[PDB]
Write an enzyme that holds these catalytic residues in place. Structure first.
Site, PDB file in Angstrom:
ATOM      1  N   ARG A  85      15.076  28.472 -29.435  1.00  0.00           N
ATOM      2  CA  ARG A  85      15.094  29.856 -29.860  1.00  0.00           C
ATOM      3  C   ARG A  85      13.997  30.086 -30.895  1.00  0.00           C
ATOM      4  NH1 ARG A  85      18.218  32.389 -34.702  1.00  0.00           N
ATOM      5  NH2 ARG A  85      17.916  34.629 -34.305  1.00  0.00           N
ATOM      6  N   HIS A 131      12.617  39.400 -35.994  1.00  0.00           N
ATOM      7  CA  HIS A 131      13.183  38.546 -37.011  1.00  0.00           C
ATOM      8  C   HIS A 131      12.629  38.884 -38.394  1.00  0.00           C
ATOM      9  CE1 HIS A 131      15.349  34.517 -37.493  1.00  0.00           C
ATOM     10  NE2 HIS A 131      15.032  34.892 -38.719  1.00  0.00           N
ATOM     11  N   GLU A 180      20.261  38.852 -37.498  1.00  0.00           N
ATOM     12  CA  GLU A 180      20.934  39.124 -38.764  1.00  0.00           C
ATOM     13  C   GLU A 180      20.724  40.505 -39.358  1.00  0.00           C
ATOM     14  OE1 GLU A 180      20.641  36.112 -41.689  1.00  0.00           O
ATOM     15  OE2 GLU A 180      20.495  34.491 -40.200  1.00  0.00           O
ATOM     16  N   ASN A 320      25.240  33.453 -36.222  1.00  0.00           N
ATOM     17  CA  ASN A 320      24.620  32.536 -37.176  1.00  0.00           C
ATOM     18  C   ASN A 320      25.652  32.162 -38.228  1.00  0.00           C
ATOM     19  OD1 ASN A 320      22.335  32.966 -35.738  1.00  0.00           O
ATOM     20  ND2 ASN A 320      21.289  34.190 -37.321  1.00  0.00           N
ATOM     21  N   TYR A 322      26.998  29.554 -41.299  1.00  0.00           N
ATOM     22  CA  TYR A 322      26.650  28.557 -42.309  1.00  0.00           C
ATOM     23  C   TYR A 322      27.797  28.176 -43.230  1.00  0.00           C
ATOM     24  CZ  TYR A 322      21.739  29.345 -41.087  1.00  0.00           C
ATOM     25  OH  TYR A 322      20.521  29.438 -40.449  1.00  0.00           O
ATOM     26  N   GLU A 395      22.445  29.757 -34.901  1.00  0.00           N
ATOM     27  CA  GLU A 395      21.982  29.150 -36.147  1.00  0.00           C
ATOM     28  C   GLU A 395      23.098  28.388 -36.840  1.00  0.00           C
ATOM     29  OE1 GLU A 395      19.942  31.498 -39.016  1.00  0.00           O
ATOM     30  OE2 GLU A 395      18.548  32.414 -37.579  1.00  0.00           O
ATOM     31  N   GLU A 453      11.211  29.393 -46.517  1.00  0.00           N
ATOM     32  CA  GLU A 453      12.552  29.954 -46.625  1.00  0.00           C
ATOM     33  C   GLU A 453      12.635  31.266 -47.402  1.00  0.00           C
ATOM     34  OE1 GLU A 453      15.028  29.296 -44.987  1.00  0.00           O
ATOM     35  OE2 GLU A 453      14.388  27.435 -44.002  1.00  0.00           O
ATOM     36  N   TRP A 454      11.879  32.252 -46.938  1.00  0.00           N
ATOM     37  CA  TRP A 454      11.859  33.570 -47.544  1.00  0.00           C
ATOM     38  C   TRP A 454      11.740  33.551 -49.071  1.00  0.00           C
ATOM     39  CZ3 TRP A 454      10.736  36.255 -43.480  1.00  0.00           C
ATOM     40  CH2 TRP A 454      11.225  35.843 -42.225  1.00  0.00           C
TER      41      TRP A 454
HETATM   42  O1  LIG Z   1      23.027  33.592 -49.659  1.00  0.00           O
HETATM   43  N1  LIG Z   1      21.886  33.701 -49.281  1.00  0.00           N
HETATM   44  O2  LIG Z   1      21.001  33.746 -50.105  1.00  0.00           O
HETATM   45  C1  LIG Z   1      21.572  33.783 -47.811  1.00  0.00           C
HETATM   46  C2  LIG Z   1      22.627  33.927 -46.871  1.00  0.00           C
HETATM   47  C3  LIG Z   1      22.339  33.948 -45.486  1.00  0.00           C
HETATM   48  C4  LIG Z   1      21.007  33.837 -45.025  1.00  0.00           C
HETATM   49  S1  LIG Z   1      20.671  33.744 -43.240  1.00  0.00           S
HETATM   50  C5  LIG Z   1      19.425  32.417 -42.880  1.00  0.00           C
HETATM   51  O3  LIG Z   1      18.864  31.844 -44.085  1.00  0.00           O
HETATM   52  C6  LIG Z   1      18.007  30.705 -43.834  1.00  0.00           C
HETATM   53  C7  LIG Z   1      17.726  30.044 -45.182  1.00  0.00           C
HETATM   54  O4  LIG Z   1      17.121  30.934 -46.107  1.00  0.00           O
HETATM   55  C8  LIG Z   1      16.740  31.146 -43.066  1.00  0.00           C
HETATM   56  O5  LIG Z   1      15.988  29.998 -42.702  1.00  0.00           O
HETATM   57  C9  LIG Z   1      17.088  31.959 -41.791  1.00  0.00           C
HETATM   58  O6  LIG Z   1      15.933  32.676 -41.362  1.00  0.00           O
HETATM   59  C10 LIG Z   1      18.274  32.946 -41.961  1.00  0.00           C
HETATM   60  O7  LIG Z   1      18.784  33.257 -40.666  1.00  0.00           O
HETATM   61  C11 LIG Z   1      19.944  33.831 -45.997  1.00  0.00           C
HETATM   62  C12 LIG Z   1      20.228  33.716 -47.363  1.00  0.00           C
END
Ligand SMILES: O=[N+]([O-])c1ccc(S[C@@H]2O[C@H](CO)[C@@H](O)[C@H](O)[C@H]2O)cc1
Ligand SMILES: O=[N+]([O-])c1ccc(S[C@@H]2O[C@H](CO)[C@@H](O)[C@H](O)[C@H]2O)cc1
Lengths: 490, 490
Positions: A85, A131, A180, A320, A322, A395, A453-454
């Protein structure tokens, strides 16, 4: 630590079941301004506000998969994955984001080559159209999904989907319109921690001039309308007996904080505002009651023609997963006033139960706590409450911390036994869930590659494959990856 | 038709279990203006709006129990009842409704004589302090329970309660502050069908100058404040190890209209607005979430000192059960707009299911449909969600229709086999419920006597004992009464 009779085996799960890994364009592609690619919201956000990303980095290079895609497929083949994916870069396909701007040939070629290569190695492609990477052009023209006209953004997204169908439809049999929606809207326009960086005045984000109680819903409402227009278009000109289309929801499991029935109610409002927010409208054509009763006028209404297009607009659904949280009740009173769109659920999401203990073991980063039970609870809600449609865990994984003051030595990084144990436990609960009548169809380990990671930048490694940034992003298999290999290979 | 072996025996319930019959002051007493008794809201309503009661009658005589009470006790003894639930006339005790007005000696004497006589025949008295009969003086002074100050009515009721505790506390070991708060508020200020006759402009009732979406809540809020204040006083200067105090709720069972989960939600909002409205406040000190989220600012807030007083204010709880309904979901939208306070539940209460068949067979009048299962469902909710307190079915029965057009001949009247059947069935479910762990303690057949049925006048006979209106209200035992007799004597 799992016993031997407990480690998931491939002969559990039928032959249909698909196993793979996932990634997202901006997180791994790199080459942000090469071969005609247009700038995106994140290119813009990271370049103008590095203070907003934990380690002042960007994804101008990422995992450099734009140039190293051939290697990614190789790793996928070696691990014996069934599918992969990945997402498409809207601005790499439509530099200006519109039909007017034109189609970028190099963008088409790249995804075309990847898809062909994948299929050549027996790897089925699961494509995520959007995305979080919005064409900055569309962002400057009308704020993107904030489009007050609720039209422009819908027409543009639709065309973008069309272009994808037009050039990749013949090879792709699995589409995911959005990834998401909840995380995207809540983080981009609620806490402003994401891409645009907006939030209500008084809050701490790059641009505190929005409205955390309104914009997330505005954006989410447009996404939903966009989804509908897209699936309608897919079903009328591209759908085939063996092709499917849906979207992927981010969702944490919700457990009652205490024994009171008030918390049971809090739990439900929580599932509703997290999952129901987007799930309910794609299944029945409107938002959850709890939300309409609490967000009131801040939650837009759908015309009747829209309700029709939305209801039942999918052939499969992505999930997704976690972690989970304890939902604690918050009464309605003249005191309490919601600040974030997520507070509209009148419930705080606690990590620690009333006994002062975490819901599950901490996996390392600031929010992932292991609670596979919550994934079973989720699958049971999809089965008993929402029509039991085909489900894909698009995910699942953890993020190994790796910072400057606390660097993660490569040898440790590769010995991600904590990640291995986590992956295995969740795979196991799917086998449990299937026997319990769940309609789960596949599992995607989140992060084939360590990547951007954003807002966390590169402080966290989520891949099953290690990416050495000090030696031209060359990848190495971790134990998790190796285990996944024998699992599919046995 | 119920077979033997299925017909309840007295040896089915513990020797502790209590059995009795019930009545209400205005409904049977009569002597509406004798021995200094003060005018009540119903005296006022029936005299000035005879058109608002089906057959244009009033209860100036009713069953004339004010003069024939000795006969009522005799019947009770003959049937071998354990208890007798009756209510006191607020205006017959306090003609002007206030402490200032003074205590009416004759009023005190009447209830004193009745209580003594009951105890002399081993009949335990369950006294309902307020059963809809508000002194007209207060009604005229500040609108009674419509008191916008949330002070006068609370203060006047508490005194009224005190006067009762003062003169009968030594003999009475069972008090019920209020009877059917929901029916009272919704019908008096919602549909305007009861006592005052107030409803919103646009609706049809005696005084369409009120507000059906507000006044019922205003009145309900005052009743609650009043209850709390009365119990607090009771617990501090009157309570004894063997004495108890609570209130009685009117409640219909709620069953999902269809299979959609939306109806399950509708069902809950229904239990909430019917039972929860007053129940939740006395159990946890505040109205149920659903209501606060739906009626919004129209439902007053409780202070903190008021929450504490309210929570736990009861040693037992009364339940008035007659039927059930299918709850059908109604979505929130710009179209629908609540008109009646009960509409805030966003759910229609249907008598017939999706298949066009009533929830249970009809018992004669416009609303009683036999559904004993609903009682079981109700006792389970009380046992599992609200602490499983001691419960008393303070009301249960049916009404034999007897009008001018279709009159009911005395012979048919006494052969109330439909009622007997109905009474027997509900007593059985009580036995089933106990075996399921219910904390039920007793059962009261509603209507020891045929009497005035509020807006229905004398068009319905609810008694187990017939009252001949053509011959000085002489009483005759119906078949139901006779069965109850052998049941208690075996
Ligand atoms: O509590 N939080 O700060 C948080 C919760 C869910 C997600 S979703 C997920 O977060 C991953 C890690 O940041 C990233 O790799 C993917 O693109 C996303 O789908 C991102 C951050
Ligand atoms: O829908 N309805 O028309 C209705 C429902 C419940 C009641 S409660 C019950 O109604 C009996 C007959 O109206 C009366 O004898 C008692 O005072 C009351 O407890 C009254 C009327």
């Amino acid at each position: 630590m799992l016993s031997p009779s407990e480690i998931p085996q491939r002969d559990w799960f039928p032959s249909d079941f698909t196993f793979g890994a996932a990634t997202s364009a901006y997180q791994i592609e790199g080459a942000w301004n090469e071969d005609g690619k247009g700038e995106s919201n994140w290119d813009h956000f990271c370049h103008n506000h590095p203070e907003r990303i934990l380690d002042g980095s960007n994804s101008d290079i990422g995992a450099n998969s734009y140039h190293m895609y051939k290697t990614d497929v190789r790793l996928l083949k070696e691990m014996g994955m069934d599918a992969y994916r990945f997402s498409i870069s809207w601005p790499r396909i439509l530099p200006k984001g519109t039909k007017e701007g034109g189609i970028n040939p190099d963008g088409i070629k790249y995804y075309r080559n990847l898809i062909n290569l994948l299929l050549e190695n027996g790897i089925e492609p699961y494509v995520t159209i959007f995305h979080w990477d919005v064409p900055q052009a569309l962002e400057e023209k009308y704020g993107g999904f904030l489009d007050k006209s609720h039209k422009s953004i819908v027409e543009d997204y639709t065309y973008f989907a069309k272009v994808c169908f037009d050039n990749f439809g013949d090879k792709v049999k699995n589409w995911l319109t959005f990834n998401e929606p909840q995380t995207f809207t809540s983080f981009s326009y609620g806490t402003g921690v994401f891409a645009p960086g907006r939030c209500s005045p008084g809050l701490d984000c790059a641009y505190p001039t929005g409205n955390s109680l309104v914009e997330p819903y505005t954006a989410g409402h447009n996404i939903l309308l966009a989804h509908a227009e897209a699936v309608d278009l897919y079903n009328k000109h591209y759908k085939r007996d063996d092709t499917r289309i849906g979207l992927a929801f981010d969702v944490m499991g919700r457990v009652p904080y205490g024994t009171s029935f008030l918390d049971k109610q809090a739990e439900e409002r929580s599932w509703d505002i997290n999952l129901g927010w987007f799930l309910e409208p794609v299944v029945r054509g409107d938002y959850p009651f709890s939300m309409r009763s609490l967000a009131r006028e801040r939650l837009p209404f759908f015309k009747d023609e829209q309700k029709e297009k939305l209801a039942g607009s999918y052939n499969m659904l992505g999930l997704n997963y976690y972690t989970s949280r304890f939902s604690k009740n918050i009464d309605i009173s003249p005191n309490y006033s919601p600040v974030l769109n997520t507070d509209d659920a009148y419930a705080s999401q606690e990590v620690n139960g009333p006994d002062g203990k975490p819901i599950g073991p901490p996996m390392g980063n600031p929010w992932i706590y292991m609670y596979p039970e919550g994934l079973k609870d989720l699958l049971m809600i999809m089965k008993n409450k929402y029509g039991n449609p085909p489900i894909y865990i698009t995910e699942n994984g953890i993020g190994d911390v790796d910072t400057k003051e606390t660097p993660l030595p490569m040898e440790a990084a590769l010995n991600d036994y904590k990640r291995l144990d986590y992956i295995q436990r969740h795979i196991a609960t799917l086998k449990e869930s299937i026997d319990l009548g769940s309609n789960v169809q596949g599992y995607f380990a989140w992060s084939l590659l360590d990547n951007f990671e954003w807002f966390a930048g590169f402080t966290e490694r989520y891949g099953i494959v290690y990416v050495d940034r000090n030696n031209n992003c060359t990848r190495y298999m971790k134990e998790s990856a190796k285990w996944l290999k024998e699992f599919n290979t046995a």
